[PDB]
Homo-oligomer: A and B are copies of this chain.
Amino acid sequence: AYVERFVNAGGVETRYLEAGKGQPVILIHGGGAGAESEGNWRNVIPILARHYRVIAMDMLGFGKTAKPDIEYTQDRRIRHLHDFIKAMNFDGKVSIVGNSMGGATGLGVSVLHSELVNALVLMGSAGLVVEYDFTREGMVHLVKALTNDGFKIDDAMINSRYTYATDEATRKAYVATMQWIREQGGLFYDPEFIRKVQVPTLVVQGKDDKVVPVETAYKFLDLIDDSWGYIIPHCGHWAMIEHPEDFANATLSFLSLR
């Protein structure tokens, strides 16, 4: 369905999944212990790959991407994504699709380095303040908590995510990542920064998202001038996982216009 590749992104070896041909679209997974490209985009990649060159990148400190001994700041993740894009073989601009932390990082690149970006998709994206014990069972509770009441847990998916979350190197980077966020009072941008997003944007949001309230989407829609909104019912914090076909199609439709 896709192949695993590695590239040196400005000094940080980076792992990505690739499938398809055509215009390049980068998928950025969310935060959380054990979160990475395969578990986040498994069922979405095939669909998107029918029309675009899909590139699912593991963020700095996550999955199989490098985990150097550094301070894991949001600024560092933004720079990493910037370096990955440059390091990749792209003839022009690329579209960026991100969930939660991945969304905040795509948003950051869309403001600091928009000349590299064609379109942005924010899905249950972090960025607005609006307002795990590392056990297999703890992972089950987490997934159920972040998804809609109708989401059916898949052991295989749970085991895969748990395996990534347990890897001591991955866990160490995760702890450092959460520490910085914790010390800032959360992962966010001032609304003024968000108002700087000028590329066409699609704000995707689950109506039942407990992490990022639906009102957050309405605020993103008010702040980002060229933003479209896609609100999904019976959907939690992970639209791409809870309703892959729905999310993939909405994304294809958005990208087809842009």
Contacts and interface: CB of A to CB of B under 8 A. Distances in A.
A257 B246 contact: yes
A13 interface: no
A53 B150 CA distance: 33
A122 to B, nearest CB: 13
A207 B226 CA distance: 10
A218 B214 CA distance: 10
A229 interface: yes
Given A221-B231, A229-B229, A249 B257 contact: yes
Interface in A203-258: 203, 207, 214, 218, 221, 225-234, 245-246, 249-250, 252-253, 256-257
A230 B232 contact: no
Contacts of A225: 233
A117 to B, nearest CB: 17
B228 A257 contact: no
A231 B207 CA distance: 14
Nearest to A201: B233
Given A218-B218, A221-B207, A245 B257 contact: yes
Contacts of A203: 231
Contacts of A218: 218
A233 B202 CA distance: 10
Contacts of A257: 245-246, 249
A171 to B, nearest CB: 38
Given A228-B233, A231-B221, A249 B245 contact: no
29 contacts: A203-B231, A207-B221, A214-B221, A218-B218, A221-B231, A221-B233, A225-B233, A226-B233, A226-B234, A227-B231, A227-B233, A228-B230, A228-B231, A228-B232, A228-B233, A229-B229, A229-B230, A229-B231, A230-B230, A230-B231, A231-B231, A245-B257, A246-B257, A249-B253, A249-B256, A249-B257, A250-B253, A252-B253, A253-B253
